[PDB]
Design a protein around this ligand. Structure first.
Ligand SMILES: CCCCCCCC/C=C\CCCCCCCC(=O)OC[C@H](COP(=O)(O)OCC[N+](C)(C)C)OC(=O)CCCCCCC/C=C\CCCCCCCC
Ligand SMILES: CCCCCCCC/C=C\CCCCCCCC(=O)OC[C@H](COP(=O)(O)OCC[N+](C)(C)C)OC(=O)CCCCCCC/C=C\CCCCCCCC
Ligand SMILES: CCCCCCCC/C=C\CCCCCCCC(=O)OC[C@H](COP(=O)(O)OCC[N+](C)(C)C)OC(=O)CCCCCCC/C=C\CCCCCCCC
Ligand SMILES: CCCCCCCCCCCCCCCCCC(=O)OC[C@H](COP(=O)(O)OC[C@H](N)C(=O)O)OC(=O)CCCCCCCCCCCCCCCCC
Ligand SMILES: CCCCCCCCCCCCCCCCCC(=O)OC[C@H](COP(=O)(O)OC[C@H](N)C(=O)O)OC(=O)CCCCCCCCCCCCCCCCC
Ligand SMILES: CC(C)CCC[C@@H](C)[C@H]1CC[C@H]2[C@@H]3CC=C4C[C@@H](OC(=O)CCC(=O)O)CC[C@]4(C)[C@H]3CC[C@]12C
Ligand SMILES: CCCCCCCCCCCCCCCCCCOC[C@@H](O)COP(=O)(O)OCC[N+](C)(C)C
Ligand SMILES: CCCCCCCCCCCCCCCCCCOC[C@@H](O)COP(=O)(O)OCC[N+](C)(C)C
Ligand SMILES: CCCCCCCCCCCCCCCCCCOC[C@@H](O)COP(=O)(O)OCC[N+](C)(C)C
Ligand SMILES: C=C(C)[C@@H]1CCC(C)=C[C@H]1c1c(O)cc(CCCCC)cc1O
Ligand SMILES: *[C@@H]1O[C@H](CO)[C@@H](O)[C@H](O)[C@H]1NC(C)=O
Ligand SMILES: *[C@@H]1O[C@H](CO)[C@@H](O)[C@H](O)[C@H]1NC(C)=O
Ligand SMILES: *[C@@H]1O[C@H](CO)[C@@H](O)[C@H](O)[C@H]1NC(C)=O
Lengths: 173, 1282, 119
């Protein structure tokens, strides 16, 4: 069905980065009409500004110099009901370091009922030049290697001990 | 030998009797009135029949009576007292009446009358002319009761009309008929109901049914302790369910807006209609009840604009609930019988939470498994005793008869034959017979090849092939009629059977779609050489033969129930029909007609009663429907079970006796096999002859080390721990693994250590034993195979190619990892070994069942070849009326103008033999069978729009299949299991470690009587022993616990605070009294309390009671927690659980339990392994199919918990078609191959039909087998215990 | 849809005439949609006169031929919609037809009573 996956925070200068704001309904059989708004506040600024608006399968970027022709839609497509408000950056820079807001507005249609709700998703992005490996993977790899090494050491120690044991037993008998 | 009972004879007999009475044994069954004529005098002179004769009995000689004859064995004793006091026994009126009563034409007259009346009550709205028939019917019933009274008397004395209990019914019906003839009282339906009692006159007149009914009544009366124990257990579990769930099914989702500032209470006073409810609450599309809710996070959720409330009516018309003790008992009975229990399971889980599936697991294990099983095992012992006594007495009677015969013997002391000779041996040699058998098999394979989308060259090929086959068979019959004796050709049942088949085939040729199925009957000719098809033939023949009276009784019972249901509620279904149908027309299942009433009765017998009961209670009141349905179950199920058990025992023992050798007559197949073997051997020897004519202790010093390395408990424990870890790591690969980066990485690296460790273990074993030992062991082969799969996956991933399809499937095969656990666990391995040895035993019966199901599948294919196609409005799924789109051409023409139209076809249908096999599996399991019946009975033709009930009488096809391939085949399976148990010279589910404490615990039940406590004489203390020593304090305590049970039942949902306080204080008083008894028992049984298990149970019960009340009032005042409060206020039931004491009908049950738990635990371990593997593979594959049918937002394969919930649900086969239906989608417009799933890249939203079918057929087969052995273990343990 | 009505009722001139029109339906009687039409005709083939109706509440058309002598004496909830005719006149002799529509049932409940005015 749907899964709510938080985005990543390691955009690398000169490369591409996908910001995924996934907001999904509590019941998937429902009919909705969803649109979204993204606002961005740099590391060195106070107020959030609006950067793009996506409604009815048309993307509208604001007159913004830090995103002019550098962000394209990479969310749900072909539908008026959106459960994936992702966007794509085709050339990451250092002005793309800051905090993003993903405002998603949902209008659910039930029997003689029209509910208007809202969600907000906060995404923090720090831009680097070399993607540093994460502590989880580094520690896991080191631990797997040390565990293999210690297991092998224990096994070989026991083999040599048993060889000496059985040689002594055979010589005794 | 017998005087005519003259005037002087009667006078002298009366004088002697009177003299003996003034001066002031048992009857013999051999000639009791109504049995037969004793052979003491053999025949009787023909010059005297039906005349009052001297009573042929010394015991009744001292009484006043006489005897009559009817030209037959039957003899009836008539009272010599005057009929009504104005009719002497010598009066010609009485003599003529006796003659008529004894004549057999009289009995045949009654038979004709009552059977015609039975055919007449089948009518639903009889016309005017039936009143004349009814009048003549009541007249004919008169002149028979009158004859009976004129022969014996009304109430004169003994041997009068009314002394035999079965004549009360006739008088009752006579007076009822002639009372309602003129007097106007009561409603029509109630009056018309009572004429069904005239059907019991069938039991009265037809011989044998009297004895059968008497035996059934005696058996029911014998069955009392099991019934009361079952009621008590259902009551205890109903109390548990009522406490845990109470108003939980009243949860719904109410709007958050409630415009016009209307409060919830202000809204739920003007809401009456479903569409009005639909505006304020949340209904799923097409559902009739509002969607259920939940407060915990594990329970169900509902949309954004809807909050959760506890107001409304319960689901299923308000009949499915736990609010009231009675409704909770109804639900617990339904869950006992497993009838539609999947809906209750899902509703309860959604309302309360998935954590409460433990309740369902426990109850399905305790009631739906154990109590039903022991009901069966207690009714089976009645048979094993009654039949033993009957055979013993029959043997004694036969021995006495033989002795009497010996005593009596001692007291006595050319034209055409010359040319017919050739055919005499040309049509009876093995070659022709084996050729005929091969032709039969080829014809079967040829006819199991038709299919719906058949091409015309194929169709005519089939036609000509069947023509050739029927010509061959007609020729082979004419070569036995014109070439052999026409009069000797009819002395063999196989000859008559073949003649019948060939005439039917000729009729079809030189002529419907049903005549072509009578060729399928020929496959029974192989029964003459296959000694399991012969066993099935014997089973069916015994059903219609020796045990035919039981079948007749069952038929009468079903007919009576159908008629009673029709009469009671047939007009209710017609008037009050908009209560149960939105279209305001009759539902599929109703009782307006006799056929439909009989279908409902058949459904209830099969085990599907609650769905129809809801509509019954909606249309025709609650009490009436409840009594009718409950009586139907209790009687019909008992009679069907009696038939099953009697037929099984007869076919097992009375039929199989090895009286003759294995085919004492030289079998043609055996002769042909011998000739073939000899010819092959000779040819091979000649060919071989012609061909020959033409032409350093180091290696040991390390191998011993490694061998001893893989022996230690340390190594074994380490590897088992690694197996557990590697298996458990698979449960985490949910659809949510993407949002758990750390755990994903740790697992992606842990699999590598696991692979390395297992490869090292494999190499160590290789060097430990060596190829000879390693590759000759199946467990080692399995482990090596799993290691190979893992190694291939690792190599592929390390070298890339991770997107390759075959490699992805091989990765999916990682779900077999847990199977490595099925070598190191002793219970698992022992159970697997015990299970493997039974496959060859049942292979033959499995093949016979496959053959029978193939015959049924071919018949079904011929009947419904591609006739389930329908024009469907996809918006709402409404089949278009046949008046608008009569066929495929018009449906397609409508596709051009409209948008949402489809010439849809059922996924499980009868298009070919495989799909027919699947449909028959669904029908035999009663899961999804109803859609198939509806589509079948709506059949019209190929490329024709189905019409409602156009082929209504195709229900008989399914009825016949259920009676034959689901009842008799199961009987055969059980029969071939029982004899397997018998062939052995001498438990095989237990391990060696469990054997020792099994033997140790054996003595626990067989314990010597406990030493009585000494009498202490001490001041006050002595009187307290005198108080608690006698059977008055104990009985008062028992009735106190009963009263406590009643005050626990009194609770309901919505009761007032006054009731709450009253019950709380009554329970406080009960706790005070129960503590008082315990303290008194302690101070009177110093140092002997705690020396009897029941006293320790009482002490712990008292303590848990006080503690439960204290924590209950503490949680209420502070730390509000409804769920934990409910759980704590559940130790009150300890008091009622203490009631099992003092009843030697529950303690033995519990001891049988505690005897069987070891084997049950081992089998459950194996079943959990299988369920774990299947759950993992389900997460792997079916985690992205469309959410439809039985797969929804709460019961899916998207997580380990959901997968295990579904697998537990279908372990019993409950709703296994609902989960399979979504998976059968392969291609659009019922699919979306390019479907985007946010948060993942698994594009595609439907599964592989082949993998789904194998999954859901294999799993149910394994579950059925495992439960069969689970039943066997407890049955054997009960056999030993009793 | 069973309607129990007397075949013929004789009422003395100047007295009160209670014509019973009772019916039986499984479904609960609800006034939001219960429908009743009371009609009068001089003969079987004569025209019918609409005087007493029930669409939502009791409505009396007060026809000139009955003036104000017709009232309601029944209860839809108790399934009796009989009316009360006071001071019966000789011209009142005729036929009364009782038409009932109780949803969701679709059958039309007809009840015919032939009232004859006695001296
Ligand atoms: C050989 C002979 C064998 C025995 C044969 C007879 C067996 C059973 C007889 C049962 C008689 C039941 C009489 C019921 C009378 C009645 O009218 O009862 C009413 C109550 C309460 O209804 P209510 O006012 O809440 O409904 C309000 C409307 N609503 C539900 C839409 C909200 O009904 C309730 O509590 C439901 C009561 C259900 C009790 C269990 C029924 C039998 C099941 C199991 C027993 C073993 C088999
Ligand atoms: C006590 C008795 C218990 C009995 C238990 C029975 C359990 C149910 C068993 C099987 C159910 C499924 C059977 C197969 C369903 C096939 C459905 C299907 O899709 O049908 C059509 C397909 C072929 O595709 P197509 O017609 O579109 O032509 C494509 C090519 N073009 C376009 C050129 C014409 O058919 C195929 O391929 C068919 C290939 C496979 C055929 C299997 C037939 C059944 C075999 C064994 C059953 C018994 C097993 C016993 C052991 C276990 C227990
Ligand atoms: C949600 C429900 C919340 C409330 C639940 C309340 C009840 C649950 C648990 C409390 C269990 C209390 C302890 C039970 C065992 C008591 C005991 O000490 O039992 C001893 C007997 C073995 O000795 P014996 O009694 O044969 O006497 C031998 C000597 N002679 C023959 C001379 C008398 O073992 C036995 O019964 C063992 C029987 C074990 C039964 C476990 C039931 C679990 C449910
Ligand atoms: O049969 C058993 C015999 C001898 O068994 P054993 O090793 O002495 O251990 C039991 C010992 N006799 C004891 O009871 O006390 O053993 C045999 O009779 C088997 C003889 C044939 C097999 C010999 C071993 C072949 C496999 C050796 C390992 C090859 C793979 C190595 C892979 C290395 C990495 C690539
Ligand atoms: C779950 C399904 C059952 C639900 C209802 C349970 C009700 C009772 C619960 C408590 C059971 C233990 C009470 C304390 C021990 C009582 C006790 O031992 O009584 C004595 C009886 C055995 O009597 P006997 O004269 O030897 O006859 C044996 C046969 N022959 O022996 C017994 O009655 C003891 C039976 C214990 C069974 C334990 C099963 C597992 C839990
Ligand atoms: C009807 C169409 C669909 C063909 C199906 C295949 C049949 C030709 C096969 C299936 C099972 C076979 C039978 C399996 C077992 C036996 C028992 C065999 O005899 C014994 O095993 C005797 C053992 C004993 O006497 O102890 C003789 C062949 C026979 C009847 C086989 C005959 C051929 C059968 C019927
Ligand atoms: C032999 C029979 C064996 C049966 C075994 C059944 C095991 C059944 C194991 O799962 C049972 C429940 O734990 C599943 O639901 P959960 O509690 O995991 O749901 C949690 C939901 N939230 C809180 C995360 C939202
Ligand atoms: C070549 O490979 C196998 C050998 O290394 C060992 O052969 P085995 O000792 O397993 O041979 C077993 C069979 N015999 C030798 C006993 C016949
Ligand atoms: C989930 C896994 C279990 C599913 C099946 C449970 C069935 C229901 C429970 O069955 C009995 C088990 O609790 C085990 O009881 P025992 O510990 O007495 O049996 C083993 C005893 N030894 C051998 C250890 C001493
Ligand atoms: C001969 C065997 C293996 C056992 C011996 C012990 C007893 C009680 C009966 C026999 C037996 C069957 O003959 C068949 C089954 C079921 C067959 C399917 C198993 C998956 C169970 C089953 O216990
Ligand atoms: C980033 O901002 C700097 C000035 O702060 C400007 O010179 C540069 O063009 C901007 N680059 C992007 C990619 O927005
Ligand atoms: C993401 O953006 C890239 C660049 O426009 C595009 O090629 C790709 O198809 C997009 N993927 C999704 C899932 O939108
Ligand atoms: C980003 O912009 C620079 C400057 O135009 C260009 O050289 C580079 O190739 C771009 N890279 C990507 C990935 O768009």
């Amino acid at each position: 069905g749907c899964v709510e996956v938080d985005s990543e925070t390691e955009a690398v200068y000169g490369m591409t980065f996908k910001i995924l704001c996934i907001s999904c309904k509590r019941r998937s059989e429902t009919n909705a009409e969803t649109f979204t708004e993204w606002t961005f506040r740099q590391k060195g600024t106070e107020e959030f500004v609006k950067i793009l608006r996506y409604e009815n399968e048309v993307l509208q970027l604001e007159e913004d110099e830090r995103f002019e022709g550098r962000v394209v839609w990479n969310g749900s497509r072909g539908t008026k009901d959106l459960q994936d408000l992702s966007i794509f950056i085709t050339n990451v820079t250092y002005n793309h370091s800051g905090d993003y807001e993903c405002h998603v507005y949902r209008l659910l249609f039930f029997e003689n009922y029209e509910h208007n709700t809202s969600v907000v998703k906060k995404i923090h992005i720090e831009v680097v030049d070399k993607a540093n490996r994460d502590m989880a993977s580094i520690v896991s790899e080191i631990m797997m290697y040390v565990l293999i090494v210690v297991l092998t050491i224990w096994l070989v120690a026991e083999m040599i001990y048993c060889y000496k044991k059985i040689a002594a037993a055979t010589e005794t008998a | 030998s017998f005087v005519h009972f003259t005037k002087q004879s009667l006078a002298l007999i009366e004088q002697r009797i009177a003299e003996r009475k003034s001066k002031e044994p048992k009857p013999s069954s051999d000639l009791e009135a109504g049995k037969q004529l004793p052979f003491i005098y053999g025949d009787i002179p023909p010059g005297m029949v039906s005349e009052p004769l001297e009573d042929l009995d010394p015991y009744y000689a001292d009484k006043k009576t006489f005897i009559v004859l009817n030209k037959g064995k039957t003899i009836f004793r008539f009272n010599a007292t005057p009929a009504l006091y104005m009719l002497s026994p010598f009066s010609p009126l009485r003599r003529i009446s006796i003659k008529i009563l004894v004549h057999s034409l009289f009995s045949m007259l009654i038979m004709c009358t009552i059977l015609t009346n039975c055919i007449f009550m089948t009518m639903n709205n009889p016309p005017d002319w039936t009143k004349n028939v009814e009048y003549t019917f009541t007249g004919i019933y008169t002149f028979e009761s009158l004859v009976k009274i004129l022969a014996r008397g009304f109430c004169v004395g003994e041997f009068t009309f009314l002394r035999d209990p079965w004549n009360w019914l006739d008088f009752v019906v006579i007076v009822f008929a002639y009372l309602t003839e003129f007097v106007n009282l009561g409603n029509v339906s109630a009056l018309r109901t009572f004429r069904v009692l005239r059907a019991l006159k069938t039991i009265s007149v037809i011989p044998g049914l009297k004895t059968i009914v008497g035996a059934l009544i005696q058996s029911v009366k014998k069955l009392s302790d099991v019934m009361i124990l079952t009621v008590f257990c259902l009551s205890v579990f109903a109390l548990i369910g009522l406490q845990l769930f109470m108003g939980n099914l009243k949860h719904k989702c109410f709007r958050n807006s409630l415009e016009n500032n209307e409060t919830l209470e202000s809204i739920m006073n003007t809401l009456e209609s479903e569409e009005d409810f639909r505006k304020y609450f949340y209904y799923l599309e097409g559902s009739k009840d509002a969607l259920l809710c939940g407060f915990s996070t594990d329970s169900g959720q509902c949309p954004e604009g809807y909050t959760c409330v506890k107001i409304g009516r319960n689901p299923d018309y308000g009949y499915t609930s736990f609010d009231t003790f009675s409704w909770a008992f109804l639900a617990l009975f339904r869950l006992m019988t497993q009838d539609y229990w999947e809906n209750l399971y899902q509703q309860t889980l959604r309302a309360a939470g998935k954590t409460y599936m433990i309740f369902f697991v426990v109850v399905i294990f305790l009631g739906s498994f154990y109590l039903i099983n022991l009901i069966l095992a207690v009714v089976a012992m009645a048979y094993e005793e009654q039949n033993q006594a009957n055979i013993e007495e029959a043997k004694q009677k036969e021995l006495e008869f033989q002795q009497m015969l010996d005593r009596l013997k001692k007291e006595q002391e050319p034209y055409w034959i010359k040319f017919k000779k050739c055919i005499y041996f040309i049509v009876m040699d093995p070659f022709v017979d084996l050729a005929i058998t091969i032709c039969i098999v080829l014809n079967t394979l040829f006819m199991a090849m038709e299919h719906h989308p058949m091409t015309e060259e194929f169709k005519n090929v089939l036609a000509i092939g069947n023509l050739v086959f029927t010509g061959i068979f007609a020729a082979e019959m004419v070569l036995k009629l014109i070439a052999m004796d026409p009069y000797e050709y009819f002395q063999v049942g196989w000859n008559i059977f073949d003649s019948l088949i060939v005439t039917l085939s000729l009729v079809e040729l030189f002529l419907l779609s049903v005549l072509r199925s009578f060729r399928l009957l020929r496959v029974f000719k192989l029964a003459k050489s296959w000694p399991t098809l012969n066993m099935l033939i014997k089973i069916i023949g015994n059903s219609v033969g020796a045990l035919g009276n039981l079948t007749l009784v069952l038929a009468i019972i079903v007919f009576i129930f159908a008629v009673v249901g029709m009469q009671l509620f047939g007009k209710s279904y017609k008037e009050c029909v908009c209560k149960i149908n939105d279209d305001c027309t009759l539902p599929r299942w109703h009782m307006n007609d006799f056929f439909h009433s009989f279908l409902i009765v058949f459904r209830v017998l099969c085990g599907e009663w609650i769905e129809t009961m809801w509509d019954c209670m909606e249309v025709a009141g609650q009490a009436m429907c409840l009594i009718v349905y409950m009586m139907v179950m209790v009687i019909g199920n008992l009679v069907v079970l009696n038939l099953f058990l009697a037929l099984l025992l007869s076919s097992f023992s009375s039929d199989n006796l090895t009286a003759i050798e294995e085919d004492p007559d030289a079998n043609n197949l055996q002769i042909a096999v011998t000739r073939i073997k000899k010819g092959i051997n000779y040819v091979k020897q000649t060919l071989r002859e012609f061909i020959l004519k033409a032409f350093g202790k180091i290696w040991w010093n390390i191998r011993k080390t490694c061998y001893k390395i893989v022996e230690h408990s340390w190594f074994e424990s380490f590897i088992v721990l690694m197996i557990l870890l590697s298996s458990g790591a698979l449960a985490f690969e949910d659809i949510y693994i993407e949002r758990k980066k750390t755990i994903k990485i740790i697992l992606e690296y842990a699999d590598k250590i696991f692979t390395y460790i297992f490869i090292l273990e494999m190499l160590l074993k290789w060097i430990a034993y060596g190829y000879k030992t390693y590759f000759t062991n199946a467990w080692c082969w399995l482990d090596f195979l799993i290691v190979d799969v893992s190694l291939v996956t690792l190599v592929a991933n390390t070298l890339g190619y991770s997107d390759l399809g075959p490699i992805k499937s091989l990765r999916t095969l990682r779900a077999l990892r847990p199977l490595r656990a099925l070598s190191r666990f002793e219970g698992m391995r022992v159970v697997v070994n015990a299970l493997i040895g039974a496959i060859p035993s049942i292979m033959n019966v499995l093949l016979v069942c496959l053959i029978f199901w193939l015959i049924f599948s071919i018949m079904g294919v011929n009947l419904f070849a591609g006739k389930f196609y329908e024009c469907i409005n996809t918006t709402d799924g409404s089949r278009f009326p046949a008046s608008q789109v009569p066929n495929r051409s018009e449906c397609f023409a409508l596709m051009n103008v409209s948008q949402n139209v489809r010439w849809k076809n059922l996924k499980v249908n009868f298009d070919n033999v495989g799909l027919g096999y699947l449909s028959l599996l669904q029908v035999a399991t009663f899961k999804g069978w109803t859609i198939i019946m509806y589509a079948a009975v709506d059949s019209v033709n190929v490329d024709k729009q189905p019409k409602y009930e156009y082929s209504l009488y195709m229900y008989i096809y399914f009825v016949v299949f259920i009676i034959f391939g689901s009842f008799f085949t199961l009987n055969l399976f059980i029969g071939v299991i029982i004899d397997n148990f018998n062939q052995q010279k001498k438990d095989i589910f237990m391990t060696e470690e469990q054997k020792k404490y099994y033997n140790a615990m054996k003595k626990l039940g067989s314990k010597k009587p406990q030493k009585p406590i000494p009498r202490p004489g001490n001041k006050i203390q002595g009187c307290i022993f005198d108080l608690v020593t006698n059977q008055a304090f104990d009985i008062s305590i028992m009735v106190l616990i009963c009263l406590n049970m009643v005050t626990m039942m009194v609770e309901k949902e919505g009761q007032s605070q006054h009731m709450t306080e009253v019950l709380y204080w009554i329970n406080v008083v009960f706790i005070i009294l129960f503590t008082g008894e315990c303290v008194l028992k302690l101070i009177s049984l110093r140092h002997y309390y705690f020396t009897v298990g029941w006293n320790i149970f009482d002490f712990v019960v008292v303590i848990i009671s006080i503690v439960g009340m204290f924590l209950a009032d503490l949680i209420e005042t502070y730390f509000v927690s409804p769920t934990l409060f409910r759980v704590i206020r559940l130790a009150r039931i300890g008091r009622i659980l203490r009631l099992v004491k003092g009843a030697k009908g529950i303690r033995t049950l519990l001891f049988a339990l505690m005897m069987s738990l070891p084997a049950l635990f081992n089998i459950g371990l194996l079943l959990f392994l299988v369920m774990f593997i299947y759950a993992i593979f389900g997460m792997s594959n079916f985690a992205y199919v469309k959410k439809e049918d039985g797969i929804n937002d709460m019961f899916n394969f998207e997580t380990f918990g959901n997968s295990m919930i579904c697998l537990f649900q279908i372990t019993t086969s409950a709703g296994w078609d609902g989960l399979l239906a979504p998976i059968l989608n392969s291609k659009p417009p019922d699919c979306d191959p390019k479907k985007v799933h946010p948060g993942s890249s698994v594009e595609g939203d439907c599964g592989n039909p082949s993998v789904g079918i194998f999954y859901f057929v294999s799993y149910i087969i394994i579950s059925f087998l495992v439960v069969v052995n689970m039943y066997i273990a407890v049955i054997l343990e009960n056999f030993s215990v009793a | 849809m069973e309607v129990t009505v007397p075949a013929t009722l004789n009422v003395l001139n100047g007295s009160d005439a209670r014509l019973p029109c009772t019916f039986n339906s499984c479904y609960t009687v609800n006034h939001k949609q219960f429908s009743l039409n009371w009609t009068y005709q001089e003969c079987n083939n004569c025209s019918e006169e609409m005087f007493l109706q029930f669409r939502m509440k009791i409505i009396n058309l007060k026809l000139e031929r009955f003036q104000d002598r017709v009232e309601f004496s029944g209860n839809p909830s108790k399934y009796d919609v009989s009316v009360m005719l006071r001071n019966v006149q000789p011209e009142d002799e005729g036929i009364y037809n009782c038409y009932i529509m109780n949803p969701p049932d679709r059958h039309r409940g007809h009840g015919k009573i032939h009232l004859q005015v006695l001296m």
